[PDB]
C-alpha cells in the first residue's frame, strides 16, 4: 500500500471535498480535476490537498 | 444478546443520535382532549389542571386527532394545520 491517499478540495470555496489515492513518487505534480460540487450544484475544479 | 462468542448484534451496529432534553417537556394534544378542559379556553395551565399533559410541560401542540365539536379558544400553543382547520370548523378561536 505504497500508494497513499489525498483529498481533492473544491475551488468553489465550499468545505466540500473528494478523497482519493495517488502515487506520489511517480506523480509529483498536483491532481486537478473538474468535478461536481453538490453544494453549489455545479461542476467545479478541485485541487489536491493533503488528507491530514 | 449472547451469540456464542460472536460479536452480538447491538455491539455490531452503531450508536447514533442524541437525546433531546427539550423533547421531554413538549406535548401532543388530541382534538378530543380539548373538550376535557373547563371554560372553553386552552392554556398549558388549563391542560395541566385537566391532567391532560403534565406538570413539567413547557410546550404542547394540538394535532388533528379525534375530533372537536364545541367551540374552543386555543391560547398560547402550537396547532397543526389540520387541527387548526378543524378548530375553525367547530367555531373556535386560536391565538398565540
Amino acid at each position: 500500500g505504497i500508494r497513499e491517499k489525498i483529498k481533492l478540495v473544491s475551488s468553489a470555496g465550499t468545505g466540500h471535498f473528494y478523497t482519493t489515492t495517488k502515487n506520489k513518487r511517480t506523480k509529483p505534480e498536483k491532481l486537478e480535476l473538474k468535478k461536481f460540487d453538490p453544494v453549489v450544484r455545479q461542476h467545479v475544479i478541485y485541487k489536491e490537498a493533503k488528507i491530514k | 444478546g449472547f451469540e456464542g462468542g460472536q460479536m452480538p448484534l447491538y455491539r455490531r451496529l452503531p450508536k447514533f443520535g442524541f437525546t433531546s432534553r427539550k423533547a421531554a417537556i413538549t406535548a401532543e394534544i388530541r382534538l378530543s382532549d380539548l373538550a376535557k378542559v373547563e371554560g372553553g379556553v386552552v392554556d398549558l395551565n388549563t391542560l395541566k389542571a385537566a391532567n391532560i399533559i403534565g406538570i413539567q410541560i413547557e410546550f404542547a401542540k394540538v394535532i388533528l386527532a379525534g375530533e372537536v365539536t364545541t367551540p374552543v379558544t386555543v391560547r398560547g400553543l402550537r396547532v397543526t394545520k389540520g387541527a387548526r382547520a378543524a378548530i375553525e370548523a367547530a367555531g373556535g378561536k386560536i391565538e398565540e
Binding site: 491517499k5 478523497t19 482519493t20 489515492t21 | 444478546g1 451469540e3 452480538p8 448484534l9 447491538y10 455491539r11 455490531r12 451496529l13 452503531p14 450508536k15 447514533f16 443520535g17
Partner: protein, 64 residues
C-alpha cells in the same frame, strides 16, 4: 426488581410504529475512500431489524 435495559442496545436501536426497530448501518464510519460511493449512499439511511435477530433485540430492550 425492575428489568434493567441493555444501555448499549438502547443507544443503537429505536422502536418503530409497528413494534419494529430501526438501526443505522455498519461499514459507514471510516475506511471510506476505498468504498464506492453507491455503497456508501445505500448504507446511510436507517434500517429495520431483521426477523432472525429481532428477538435478541427485544430481550435486550424490555421497556423499548
Amino acid at each position: 426488581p425492575k428489568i434493567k435495559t441493555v444501555r448499549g442496545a438502547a443507544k443503537r436501536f429505536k422502536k418503530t410504529g409497528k413494534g419494529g426497530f430501526k438501526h443505522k448501518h455498519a461499514n459507514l464510519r471510516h475506511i471510506l475512500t476505498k468504498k464506492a460511493t453507491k455503497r456508501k449512499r445505500h448504507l446511510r439511511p436507517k434500517a429495520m431489524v431483521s426477523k432472525g435477530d429481532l428477538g435478541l433485540v427485544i430481550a435486550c430492550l424490555p421497556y423499548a
